[model samples]
Target chain A: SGFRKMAFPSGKVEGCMVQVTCGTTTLNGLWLDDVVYCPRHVICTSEDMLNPNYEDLLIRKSNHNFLVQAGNVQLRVIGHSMQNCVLKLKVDTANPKTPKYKFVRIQPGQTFSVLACYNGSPSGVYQCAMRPNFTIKGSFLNGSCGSVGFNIDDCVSFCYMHHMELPTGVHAGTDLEGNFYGPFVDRQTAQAAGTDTTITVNVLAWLYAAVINGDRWFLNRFTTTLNDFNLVAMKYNYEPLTQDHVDILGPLSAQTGIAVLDMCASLKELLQNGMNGRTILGSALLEDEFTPFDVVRQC
Target chain B: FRKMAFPSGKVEGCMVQVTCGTTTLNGLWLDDVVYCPRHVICTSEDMLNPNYEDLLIRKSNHNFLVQAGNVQLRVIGHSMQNCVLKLKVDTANPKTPKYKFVRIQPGQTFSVLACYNGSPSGVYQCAMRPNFTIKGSFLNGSCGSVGFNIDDCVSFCYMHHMELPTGVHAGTDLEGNFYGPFVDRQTAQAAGTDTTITVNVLAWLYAAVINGDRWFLNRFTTTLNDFNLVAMKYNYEPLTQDHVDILGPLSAQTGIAVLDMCASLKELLQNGMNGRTILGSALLEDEFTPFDVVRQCS
Candidate 1:
């Protein structure tokens, strides 16, 4: 009866939360959009960013603690002869290990971080001092400091896989000036939660444009009008369609289609919970907006 | 077609390493997945969320020496309690990494790397050498529950690689930040530095044997997952959790808050995890200043 679809009548299951936050703009600003209404933890830039602004950083690096050591050309200051300091070594003189910084001069109790032996000892980056858990970074003598690139988790694989929520006057983490808010925040509310990645990018772009235009009477009424579509029988079911899953389902998985990858998340939860309020194929939007800077410039 | 990075997957945040005896440990690889692929790295390979897992760390330095990268370990003893542990490699700028590692000695067979792809170019430096060696006499049993995953085998080897107290659970808090190993005895008993229970107890002992051949699984017994399957096909088990609220586990408030933090990390690895010294066996940093401590394992 007129292609059914009533159920959701705005129980408001709206969702989306794609973030590319790395100080946002200068790379790291992809963001899919939508955490019901607002809240992207200001992209973790404090009670965090974007519902009003955006940014990024914390993509990955510094996997753990510290002591990624690479020195001992001799060191140990045991400080307290009136705690003095002066050291900076990033040296080298050849063997093509070329790189220099050196500048040392301290004299309290312990010593011998010496390095200037031309042909062999060519490896440097030392300028010591610090002590907490085992602290020192860019200093405290030899690398591994403040290395964060954070992604402390929570991108919500399609906002709790269809168990969606977060709309009415939405809120996020850390506010009362103590700072550190949460969630993707905003980019036009993650671009209107793109009503679930624009209805599964127009049913995987008009069924792969009806399989490259060989329409055969409109693909025999589209294979009996999508016979039991559990995502087109499990992701565009195959009978000869494996050019590496069509080279990543065309244009690098269509440049993160409101991203929640697991092969279009049951076609974005079957066009948002069983074809909510209809008109999926008639939208006129066919795909090709390709962004995370077009596959990071493909290589 | 992809050529690499499948070799025992892992890759939550990458950079692993375990190597025992002369100690290696290293960390970060966590394996939560939030059911399946929520976030971690550049990881996509068409994305079905199959990084398998290796489980690991965070915030760091519960006496870990260095959690983020290149490598940094310490213990400093070699008399009586026997501890020669002292490793270092942070040459800086993303330094130390050529990777190959996997099962480690005994015929050997590791693979992983399929993303950053390199090794003299061409491609495939899919890397994952957070090393895993072993033998503190393969840590003689303790944690608890095996075949059904209760405390889980030696509580997943007291949260992958430890030897703490290079003076109060080892280095970094001035800002280099590396909190783990014991998180300052869960902060002298406040128990909050909890790094997702040291990255899901190293992904329940690196995916509890599905051919990644965890290398005789640390020699002892206990800790198994993917729902036990007859002692994970005879690999063996008997399992174990936390001092954080007594170390969490009620069953499903998510397995009793993950088995009470694995019985508070095996009650602070048998109380206040010890080890630290630096008179000389080498690997000395800032030259030497470690001084006698205890327990270096095995």
Candidate 2:
């Protein structure tokens, strides 16, 4: 029978590794229950996800009632070339004068959803590709594509067309991640559409998450510029949509159904008389470039 | 002739299409200048290379005063136990600290290198497994023994040790799209003497810009476990060092080496302690976890 005890340290009574000794008197007692020092995205569910409430989640349960009563709404339109057209949703939960609403731009018929959950606010424009990012048609008087001209039909009736159009997915590479990304047709090809085609485009992009909210302590507008996007594209060596960016011109034009001539129609029509403009009238909202319209409601 | 005149509306005198009255006369404008627009990108050369300070290119006639950066400070340690260490990183210009520091448990030795360009800001801390995804060890000062430990010796004097650490190609199936697409390692092998290993990392990431210098907005803490090194006696799904478990008889004695890596930051940033506090107290700053992964940074 082998019974041996391993020796760790003996009589070093001196340095950092010193071991003290006590007179040899052994009393074996049963050890009492020892208190050993023990001891670590929650994604929101569908019901919880009835509205995008990340801000609320970031808060404690105490503020739930106030937040709900305040109301929250969201709406989004994902896709391409959404600048040409705008979708204005009027959500009337009860208020008469202000209809709590949002505006969104679907990128060339891409599937982008928007949410609008709020409590106190009345109906107002909630989401849309605010200019720079989107080009407003001639008449936006409640969807009136006003004076601006189009080759095919009436602009007002076109603006008031309320039905949501399904998005179009062109080519195998449309979904694939690679060099050839964006609109289905090119500009040179659209040039073949003859000179009669009225074309325009607003290049500002506004689907990012925090553009419209209040956590804008970090967004600095003065430093941001179109050249910034150019810089980013160049930094990553990405292609910039220049005047000669004909590669994506055809798909972009076809998707928007016009050439670059009509890009300023929406702004021109809306601001013709100079009313207290929709886009804070040039107040310079630079922090909002990438913030999507819906997430901004809670902000 | 590729020339034409404006056609007046039949009903009115308004110009409608490019044509003549009935037979459409050809008044072609020859040699008309055609203008096409395009876009371009430009940046100062000094912006990319921190060392250069080119005063000639000025913003408002003032040479931009910019400091260099080292995305994040990383460390490679070896065979040091119950060790207290402090890794000092120069953020250069004192901008507010965006993210509290973080530590990866037995953090695949090399994976931490990914922080060099900056952190994958949104990525969770649990993706620390090498060969497979398993509950391995907590880097935020929680569980111990399961991942890497202080008692083990790695090939380098300062680094995690493993048989086949993350290969130099720490990328995925998709090009430009970077993420851990592969699985775990096989066996646990301690770093032997006379071997050299290195770790690499990057700066924080941005959504619109896949890469950028914005730091994390919040503090992150998590447990890391599971490992799969390739070589050694521990064959297939083998346990390397399970002594520091919460249930083990000697559990109380286990010093959570990896978890301290993260906790140190909390102690420093959150608790208002300076760099010296964590360095003097924790004993493992810049030191290596005993887990055999990479050999050394040198």
Candidate 3:
């Protein structure tokens, strides 16, 4: 068992080690039931995921509510009483002000379906970089990007666009871990529109993923940053910013890198003035050389 | 161009990301210079989750040597700004076990060289602020210093890991015994004679910085014989809460503080390693010390 047990002398013990993904970094977490412990990542989850009261699930729970950059799948019965079994996944879009939600409750089946995403690059979009690691009866289950490790039938993907004008949410397919990432932006189009397109894709991905599996603490942190951004954006009347507008603006900056000079319509100020610590805007926030108004560089 | 929170914060994403290492710490409880507790708290966690373990532990067979640290006991972060960096030796009598003291003046850029004794020691750019933080990188030399072992020494910046000197032993030990809660006399005494204190050294240290105070360590000590221990950590089982009940403050003060390679300011400044001030800061004044102090004692 790669699982290491931490037992104190006099035999008092703590921690059951298992692999855990925190944002883009993967490391070990000590689990003692539903809670997984890490530096600032002490987390807790609930069994009543689907029919859960949002507050209880996201808050009234434990040390931490979400795993920030985390993923999950639930065996839920959508519609009426036990109407049908669906791989119900509900995620909120990034907007600390008043988050709107989207879900993937497609198809009726007994087979499990999982969704996951990770930022592979600093300015990279969120991709399904890991297999959804789920536990059954309090035991860790090995996940494969191929869905071969579980009773999962096929890897799935999807995107939620904001009025067809812009791609609001996207997951472009699966990685080796069998984590599903649906592609929302056309590769050729995105590249043609911006420089280092990954930044755009990465931004949209994390915004969606942030609300998906994030714990309470993670959500609080993300939301804090989101709100911080909102305050910054409001000053510019920056379109009240939706996941959709983000796609157009982020990727558009890549090619325009330092070439664009419109401060009136730029995230450059919003990016720097706000986004503490992790500064999630980088994917939609990557690149460099600080020119502000779509600047990739921070000098 | 790099992590803005480099020294005190642990950054995860970004191309120019940096970490604080397996440990991170703060020297003062606050920026009050005069009033803030002169405390220090170094932990297995990063300063910002700064998780300096990545940058500090560096890949090499070297270390950060300090022969002279221009310390001022003024207020680099607590345990009192009093003897921030103390360098001293005995005056003839081995029975006397003399000591040295130091404290850098304000705005000195907190210069303490991490001199490496290894082969072809390269220069690493270093940075320091009166805000109670310092760090250097081999790639950038604006701060100053050229050495090899220094890569791993960023983790060595602190006087020691955030473990408690229960006057005894502990840390994430192999025996997994109840370890840590590195506290000063006041907090322990404040914990009261028999009032059991639940010490999650990590959590305590975590909240120390993350919380309002940045409550870093106030001072170093050889023993903490005041409170009672219940099973340190997310802590305890049959090693029982009852143990604190049976022994009183003696129960909690079981383990010694977790001290290793980084020279002990407690020993070098006030006492000395077995009465020998052989370990001193590499940047400031002058003194004789081991290149790998951790190797010598730990």
TM-score ranking of the models:
1, 3, 2
Q: TM-score of predicted model 2?
A: 0.17
Interface RMSD of each: 27.5, 40.7, 20.5
lDDT of 2 by residue, B183-212 (tens): 112233222221111111100011101212
Candidate 2 regions exceeding 4 Å error are A1-299, B1-95, B98-103, B107-126, B129-237, B240-298
lDDT of 1 by residue, A117-180 (tens): 1111111111111111111111111111111111011221111110011242121211111122
State which docking tier applies to candidate 2: incorrect
Which residue window of length 10 is worst by lDDT in model 2 chain A? A31-40
lDDT of 3 by residue, B1-298 (tens): 0010111111000001111123111221111211111111223232333322343234221221111112222212212122121111112112111111122211122112221111111111222222222223111211112111112122222221121222111111111111123332222311112211222222222222222222223344432221112122212211223322333322123222222100122233233234221111111111101111111112
Give the TM-score of each candidate: 0.20, 0.17, 0.19
Query: lDDT (0-100) at residue A61 of candidate 1?
Result: 16
TM-score of chain B of each: 0.16, 0.17, 0.16
lDDT of 1 by residue, B12-127 (tens): 22334323322333332222100001112112341243322221122121323333334343422111101111223332323222222112211111121111111100001111
- Model 3 complex DockQ against the native: 0.02
Model 1 ranges off by over 4 Å: A1-199, A202-299, B1-94, B97-112, B115-298
lDDT of each: 0.21, 0.19, 0.21
List ranges where model 3 is wrong by over 4 Å: A1-16, A19-178, A182-299, B1-298
Model 2 chain B weakest lDDT span, ten residues long? B33-42
- Evaluate every candidate with DockQ and list the scores: 0.02, 0.01, 0.02
